[PDB]
């Protein structure tokens, strides 16, 4: 049923190790952060901080 | 003292990006070492 479209290509091995990556808000947006350690999922976090 | 997990370097993996089935090259010759932490578990409850 589903058209299995082969996309055959070249597959050379290469070094692949994760590196840290920050995600930042541009031009007028701010990223909150719950500095509180005991976290519960939803709910209040009376230790918030903007970064 | 040390608990071990036996495993293989698979090739035909299901892509985590979407519904697919990739296939990669045979593993290289040499030592492939990775000393990595474990900071998480994913669990689910029993059916009944």
């Amino acid at each position, epitope marked *: 049923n589903c058209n*299995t479209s*082969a996309i*055959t*290509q*070249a*597959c050379p091995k290469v070094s692949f190790e994760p590196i840290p990556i920050h995600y930042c808000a541009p031009a007028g947006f701010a990223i909150l952060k719950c500095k509180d350690k005991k976290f519960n999922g939803t709910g209040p976090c009376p230790s918030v901080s903007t970064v | 003292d040390s608990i071990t997990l036996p495993c*293989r370097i*698979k*090739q*035909i*993996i299901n892509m985590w990006q979407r519904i697919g*089935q990739a*296939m990669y*090259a*045979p593993p290289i010759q040499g030592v492939i070492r990775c000393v990595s932490n474990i900071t998480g578990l994913i669990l689910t409850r029993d059916g009944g």
Partner: antibody
Amino acid sequence: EVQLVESGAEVKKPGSSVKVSCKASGDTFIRYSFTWVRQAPGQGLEWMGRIITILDVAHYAPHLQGRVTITADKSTSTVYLELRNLRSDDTAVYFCAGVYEGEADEGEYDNNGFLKHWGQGTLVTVSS
Amino acid sequence: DIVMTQSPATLSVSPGERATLSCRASESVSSDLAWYQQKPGQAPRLLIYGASTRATGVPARFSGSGSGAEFTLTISSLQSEDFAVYYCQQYNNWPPRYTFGQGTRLEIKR
């Protein structure tokens, strides 16, 4: 160890299409890779195409591309070669070949390029 | 396609002595050449794969080696059934546009 039986010799006319089946037995059919190779009379082997059974994908030779489709069915566990636009000098002996590549169902795959197991060899002669 | 030229193409050596067969690669095939033996009448048989590794159920007297653009298959002692056409097929390229060899010719000394 594991034998493959090919279909009988078939004779057709130019402008038609031909189909030849190679049936593999002895192991699990789906755990194999199959290469179709042809030999012209008095000429060296000619690599036609390849198919990965676990994955159902084929790659054919460029100069021969466009008139050949290689398929396979795991239910009956056999691989079919289909050739279009038959023409005289294409008279030749056709060979199926199969190679074991590791535990393919679970995810392991070697992708060997050589040929180990062979069919008995069908003969196709297209002429007047 | 991919061309395969060899120089010298073939040399004449009388049967009864040790003979070596040389396969030349147009491209840089690391260890991806296999050797097949075809006596006339049926399908060929793989002997060396990986350009060095012996196939299962084949005599160990045959010895293949080489890399890059130069590969050589050597016999130790000739046998009655070891007079056939030897094909050297490379499979280094990907996607698999593999190309076979040309075989080796031996003439009947009448």
